[PDB]
Amino acid sequence: VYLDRKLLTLEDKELGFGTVKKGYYQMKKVVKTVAVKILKPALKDELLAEANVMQQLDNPYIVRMIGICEAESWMLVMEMAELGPLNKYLQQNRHVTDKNIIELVHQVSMGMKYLEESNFVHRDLAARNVLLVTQHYAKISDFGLSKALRADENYYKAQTGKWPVKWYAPECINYYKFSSKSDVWSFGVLMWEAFSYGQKPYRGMKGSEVTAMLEKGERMGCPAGCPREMYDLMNLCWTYDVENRPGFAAVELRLRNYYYDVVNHHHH
Numbered sequence: 001v002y003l004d005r006k007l008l009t010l011e012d013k014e015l016g017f018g019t020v021k022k023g024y025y026q027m028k029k030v031v032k033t034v035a036v037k038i039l040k041p042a043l044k045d046e047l048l049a050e051a052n053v054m055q056q057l058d059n060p061y062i063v064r065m066i067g068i069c070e071a072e073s074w075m076l077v078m079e080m081a082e083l084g085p086l087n088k089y090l091q092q093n094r095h096v097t098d099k100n101i102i103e104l105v106h107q108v109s110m111g112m113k114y115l116e117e118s119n120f121v122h123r124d125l126a127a128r129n130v131l132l133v134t135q136h137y138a139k140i141s142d143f144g145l146s147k148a149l150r151a152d153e154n155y156y157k158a159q160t161g162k163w164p165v166k167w168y169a170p171e172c173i174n175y176y177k178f179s180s181k182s183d184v185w186s187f188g189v190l191m192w193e194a195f196s197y198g199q200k201p202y203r204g205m206k207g208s209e210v211t212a213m214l215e216k217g218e219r220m221g222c223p224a225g226c227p228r229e230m231y232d233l234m235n236l237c238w239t240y241d242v243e244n245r246p247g248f249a250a251v252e253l254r255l256r257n258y259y260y261d262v263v264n265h266h267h268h
């Protein structure tokens, strides 16, 4: 996992803990374009824990880590997803079709089905953390809050924090318990963001007002032009009771089947 600084070439400009910069890494033969997270002891430990999670994952729909390097600061080197975050892409590309959005959120569900099978919880699943390789190829990124589940438990219990509350399930807020089912709830919010072309969820509401709304059984409305089948899936992800909420195997299957029905309608 330890990379050679002499083989890494960093660009001066910043793409976006610190910063994300574009670079190039000399591989065995080819040169590879990379995205590098550069830190600007708690930050070092967090980056190394993130590196430890990514090291264990191998799936076409999850950003691959190339390695780590300790130079000017600690650096986490990843494969580059040229088109950037999904929310920003859709805000700038409103012509993207409903079929293309289904294709991308289905890819995220495949990556998450893999993470669930791997017994890792993401804990920051949102459209800003889905990166586009192409307009037809999404990858999940940003494993800074992710956790490997213990062998005897299907959830992570947080003790302390600065949380993305609008993407969190009720049991995360009420019991500090994070599971693959909690990530399913976040995935419902991510689907809403995607079909709303990168609009922020729960516009104009405080985190506490969001909790109050959800407790009353109320949910965000259907985005303009969103297929009813996809809005129904969002509502199923937003099942209040964790036991009754589907896991990613059930979600990916529903998305897969619907995507094939849409691919069929297009051919007709």
Ligand SMILES: NC(=O)c1cnc(N[C@@H]2CCCC[C@@H]2N)nc1Nc1cccc(-n2nccn2)c1
Pocket (backbone or CB within 6 Å): 015, 016, 020, 035, 063, 078, 079, 080, 081, 082, 083, 084, 085, 128, 129, 130, 131, 141, 142
């Ligand atoms: N492998 C990667 O390509 C990569 C992995 N992870 C991330 N993480 C960032 C953290 C900052 C928030 C946004 C995102 N979750 N960004 C990556 N690339 C990237 C590519 C183009 C643009 C940007 N970009 N545009 C605006 C901000 N960042 C990032």
